[PDB]
Design a protein around this nucleic acid. Structure first.
Ligand code: MG
Ligand code: MG
Ligand code: MG
Ligand code: MG
Ligand code: MG
Ligand code: MG
Ligand code: MG
Ligand code: MG
Ligand code: MG
Ligand code: MG
Ligand code: MG
Ligand code: MG
Ligand code: MG
Ligand code: MG
Ligand code: ZN
Lengths: 94, 94, 37, 50, 67, 148, 86, 120, 49, 177
RNA sequence: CCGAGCCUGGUGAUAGCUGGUUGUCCAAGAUAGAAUCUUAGUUCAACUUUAAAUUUGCCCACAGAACCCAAAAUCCCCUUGUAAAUUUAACUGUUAGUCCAAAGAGGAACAGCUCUUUGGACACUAGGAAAAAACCUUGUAGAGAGAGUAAAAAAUUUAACA
């Protein structure tokens, strides 16, 4: 007795969820945090025109470092030492 | 030896009599055994806490299945306390 | 389903939390306005 | 209704919460709610809601 | 001790106590198995780990009269 | 696995930590081959590192057979008579060194599930808990609803 | 437990975060010698050092931007002076 | 339908009660926002999560610094509900080179340049 | 360790419980008067740097 | 300690016979405390596998009181097993037929649903009246207190309390009453 | 065992259709539509993958984008915060999709109904809502006999009258 038509959480008839002081206090806490975020986002330090052209140097020098890193792609170097160390598998005492 | 305790290493008979002899040598009154606490006396699992009191002063208490086991265990406890081999004694210095 | 319905369309859980948080909390004095004043 | 919406002690009102999108609840909400804020749900009308 | 205890806020001073411990044993832990299996997606995977583990013995404790 | 595998409580031999410590590795037995690509690591280890290892550890004893073996072995006998053998087949010198050192640092008992990471042979001070520690007594020790 | 209390007191919400409970060395030689740092402490102090370098970088970049702006405004003023002097 | 939500700029004008509540003087505004990620980036739009990734908040409960400038405040506004913001405060002035290493953060947004690790 | 203490040395756990209760009572006195009073002796905290 | 091994183990894992009086107390609360003590949460050595329970005794189960009209609207329902064997009975009728079954079912519900439930319920003991068999009022240890308080009656309130409590208003003389 | 016998051979007939598809381990990775005797399929596109060359790629700041007949928003977009993006050689696989929230169309302002758009989730782990795909918290992977937190438990009782 007391079944829910179809699935318990969807459709024209679903299971009625209800709210508790637990969830209420949780979300109002989050809302107060969001209010503090709004406050601290207000009162900026500098203006658009003041902050326009200070970081271009750093940005483009970082990007040209990325350029160099991406361009520097070649096969590794090959060595006779690593080539001949394979001969040392047949080592044996006299 | 650290683990194996005194009465586990060395065996005794009539420990109550041994205790009597000991504290008579130490010149103190002959104590009486009195059940301090009881539980399940009629139950199949009797439990007695017997204290050995001299001159209205307690030296040791002992748990036990029966009153005899409780009083002999209290005698054992008092003997340990007098000989200084209590489990809470100073560890061995190295 | 549609937004507008004959029956009361059950709302989302977050929405119901918000609607349960937002109500008229009547400003009442600590003293009832009849017995003391 | 005006004096109730002026004198409500609850600091949190769907007006502010939705116009700011304080918790991304614009998912569950509609653009219509921005003006049908709390009083309306579908065609219905909740006058006690403030 | 049997009759008293000393607890810090949060921890005790260095000069008050001296806890000494000796190393006795270094080992690799016994082979622990990590199997991940999911259903009807041929997702079956295993790995063996032998974490290192060290054994100490507390040899002596002494307290200082400083207080 | 725990239920399939046996278990033990943490313990040490003859109380090794209290008195003078003794590394409970006793004996090593190497089985290495003159030839064999698998035993080249063991040959390098015995030619250079084993000298310094034996110098650092005098209490241990080392035996080397140097016989034909398709897979080189190392056997370790500890104080209790615990024998454990492991294959050094095709192993590098550094991992051989780490292996022999962990053998030296191990104790004389099989690795199995340890039920508890501690061991106190006298855990209780102020007395072990019994039901009557934290409840008072009665005048003349009278049970509830008892006249005399 | 007590995270918000610790926060309002000034300490870490989780005592394992920072403070003497975690930052101090957990073992030293019986002869009184200092043990080497733990890898956790090393990475923590490295993170903090990068953090400080970054903060200094950001602060001095903002200061340089404001300085350049005000210098450009002085440039503007003096070039207006030039214009009307012409 | 659900789209990127424009915020009314009137929201970001603090009142005197708000100033004296949060302890922030409109004059002499701070320079740096310490930021932490508090909310799930899942069940959020791709643009929000990409802004998270570019600000460097893919890791939660890990403080990261940004400037106080509108170019950044835009991103912070659009991902404000996912993060805890606080200003930076320091009594000991900018960290000196000798004390780059022995720095320490506090729960109160403070950055102490010296950390003696010892009670008064 | 709290459980091990409560098991093997109930006296120390009883001392801890007494400490906690006294701190509760100090917190109640503070709830009565937050400031304008001498703070609790055990409610006092250590400042580290 | 300085106790022997087997006696110490015995004294630690021993059972205890607790007693509580249910006269004008709620079955819910008294059964809750009895249940926690039956499975043995009260002792710090609690573990399910270790049968560390204790024996409990309730007294005057007949003289219990609910809060509200539960005597009327609470329905204990059970199916015998046959067609039409679905029976429902109010707490009042079930009390009249068996004054113990209420507290019994209460504890049976409070307890966990393990096989230890039956063992704990037979550890427990119940008596509707102020009367107990010799052994099972002899081998007791302690009588723990009641969960709620008993409000006093006017016949119980002494005179000094009455004359200390101030009178609130002055009635007009011209009134029949 | 005849809608046309049985045997052999072609014949390993063909089968867009069902089924099955063998050792260990790491990573990246479900995706608009068009055409088709085509809608149980396939080619292209798009997505994804690999190895290379190159440089701008993403977020975006004022300005800017219609008369006809009052929306959330969108396009473009320097700075800034970040590190990816495009192109070149090579294929394969996906191309039968479900719920929720929102703007709508059909229907009964029915459907766990069907059809488009924006987003999320699921088809990847975990905790919770009773068990629960799609609801809410939450990701980058281990040992722990350490700790702080996230979402997270429903409240209701009703009517006298001169
Ligand atoms: Mg269903
Ligand atoms: Mg819809
Ligand atoms: Mg035929
Ligand atoms: Mg035929
Ligand atoms: Mg075929
Ligand atoms: Mg086909
Ligand atoms: Mg198939
Ligand atoms: Mg992967
Ligand atoms: Mg066409
Ligand atoms: Mg651009
Ligand atoms: Mg289909
Ligand atoms: Mg459908
Ligand atoms: Mg449908
Ligand atoms: Mg699929
Ligand atoms: Zn009144």
């Amino acid at each position: 007795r007391g079944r829910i038509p179809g699935r318990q959480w969807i459709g024209k008839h679903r299971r009625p969820r209800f709210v508790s002081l637990r969830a209420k206090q949780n979300m109002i806490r989050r809302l107060e945090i969001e209010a503090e975020n709004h406050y601290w986002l207000s009162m900026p330090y500098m203006t658009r025109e003041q902050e326009r052209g200070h970081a271009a140097v750093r940005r483009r020098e970082a990007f040209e470092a990325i350029k160099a890193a991406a361009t520097s792609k070649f096969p590794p170097h090959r060595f006779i030492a690593d080539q001949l160390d394979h001969l040392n598998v047949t080592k044996k005492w006299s | 030896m650290t683990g194996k305790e005194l009465f586990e290493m060395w065996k005794i008979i009539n420990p109550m009599g041994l205790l009597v002899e000991e504290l008579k040598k130490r010149n103190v009154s002959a104590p009486e055994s009195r059940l301090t606490r009881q539980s399940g006396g009629t139950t199949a699992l009797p439990l007695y806490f017997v204290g050995l009191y001299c001159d209205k002063k307690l030296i040791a208490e002992g748990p036990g299945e029966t009153v005899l086991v409780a009083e002999e265990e209290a005698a054992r406890v008092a003997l340990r306390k007098l000989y200084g081999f209590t489990e809470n004694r100073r560890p061995w210095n190295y | 389903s549609k937004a507008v319905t004959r029956h009361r369309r059950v709302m989302h859980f977050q929405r119901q939390k918000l609607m349960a948080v937002t109500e008229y909390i009547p400003p009442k004095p600590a003293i009832h306005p009849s017995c003391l004043p | 209704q005006e004096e109730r919406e002026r004198n409500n002690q609850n600091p949190w009102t769907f007006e502010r919460i939705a116009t700011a999108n304080m918790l991304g609840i614009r998912k569950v909400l509609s653009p219509y709610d921005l003006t049908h804020k709390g009083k309306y749900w579908g065609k219905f009308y909740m006058p006690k809601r403030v | 001790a049997d009759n008293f205890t000393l607890l810090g806020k949060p921890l005790l001073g260095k000069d008050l106590v001296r806890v000494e411990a000796t190393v006795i044993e270094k080992t690799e832990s016994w082979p622990r198995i990590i199997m991940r299996f999911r259903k009807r997606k041929n997702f079956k995977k295993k790995r063996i780990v032998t974490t290192p583990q060290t054994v100490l013995r507390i040899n002596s404790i002494e307290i200082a009269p400083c207080l | 696995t725990a239920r399939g595998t046996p278990s033990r409580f943490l313990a040490s031999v003859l109380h090794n930590g209290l008195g003078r410590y003794v590394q409970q590795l006793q004996r090593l037995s190497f089985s290495v081959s003159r030839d064999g690509a698998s035993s080249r690591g063991a040959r390098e280890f015995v030619e250079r590192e084993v000298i310094d290892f034996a110098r650092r550890n005098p209490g241990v004893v080392i035996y080397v057979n140097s016989r034909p073996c398709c897979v080189p072995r190392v056997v370790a006998e500890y104080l209790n008579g615990a024998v454990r053998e492991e294959s050094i087949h095709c192993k590098s010198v550094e991992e051989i060194s780490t292996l022999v050192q962990k053998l030296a640092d191990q104790s004389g008992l099989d690795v199995i599930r340890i039920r508890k990471p501690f061991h106190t042979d006298n855990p209780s001070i102020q007395g072990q808990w019994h039901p009557f520690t934290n409840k008072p007594t009665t005048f003349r020790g009278l049970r509830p609803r008892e006249v005399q | 437990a007590g995270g918000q209390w610790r926060l309002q007191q000034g300490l870490a919400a989780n005592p394992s975060g920072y403070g003497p409970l975690t930052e101090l060395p957990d073992w030293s030689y019986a002869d009184g010698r200092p043990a080497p740092p733990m890898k956790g402490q090393l990475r923590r102090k490295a993170e903090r050092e990068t953090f400080a370098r970054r903060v200094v970088l950001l602060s001095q970049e903002m200061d340089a931007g404001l300085q350049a702006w005000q210098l450009r405004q002085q440039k503007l003023q003096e070039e207006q002076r030039k214009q009307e002097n012409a | 339908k659900f789209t990127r939500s424009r915020i009314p700029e009137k929201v970001f004008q603090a009142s005197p009660e708000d100033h004296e509540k949060y302890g922030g003087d409109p004059q002499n505004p701070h320079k740096l926002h310490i930021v932490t990620r508090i909310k799930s980036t899942r069940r959020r739009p791709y643009w929000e999560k990409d802004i998270i990734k570019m600000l460097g908040l893919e890791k939660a409960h890990t403080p990261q610094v940004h400037k106080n400038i509108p170019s950044v405040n835009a991103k912070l506004k659009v991902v404000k509900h996912l993060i805890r913001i606080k200003p930076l405060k320091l009594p000991q002035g900018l960290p000196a080179e000798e004390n780059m290493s022995n720095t320490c953060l506090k729960s109160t947004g403070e950055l102490v340049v010296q950390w003696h690790l010892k009670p008064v | 360790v709290l459980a091990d203490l409560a098991i093997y040395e109930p006296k120390t756990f009883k001392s801890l419980a007494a400490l906690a209760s006294r701190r509760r009572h100090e917190g109640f006195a503070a709830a009565l008067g937050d400031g304008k009073e001498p703070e609790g002796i055990f409610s006092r905290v250590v400042q580290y740097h | 300690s300085s106790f022997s091994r087997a006696p110490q183990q015995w004294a630690t894992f021993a059972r205890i016979w607790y007693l509580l009086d249910g006269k004008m107390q709620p079955p819910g609360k008294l059964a809750a405390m009895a249940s926690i003590r039956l499975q043995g949460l009260h002792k710090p050595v609690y573990h399910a596998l270790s049968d560390c329970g204790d024996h409990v005794v309730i007294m005057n189960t007949r003289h219990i009181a609910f809060s509200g009209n539960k005597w009327e609207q609470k329905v204990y329902s059970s199916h015998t097993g046959y067609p039409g064997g679905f029976r429902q009975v109010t707490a009042a009728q079930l009390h009249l037929r068996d004054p113990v079954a209420i507290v019994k079912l209460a504890i049976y519900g409070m307890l966990p649903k393990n096989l230890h439930r039956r063992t704990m319920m037979e550890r427990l003991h119940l008596f509707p009246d102020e009367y107990i068999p010799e052994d099972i009022l002899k081998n007791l240890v302690e009588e723990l207190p009641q969960p709620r308080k008993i409000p006093k009656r006017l016949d119980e309130y002494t005179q000094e309390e009455i004359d200390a409590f101030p009178r609130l208003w002055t009635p007009p003389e011209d009134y029949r009453l």
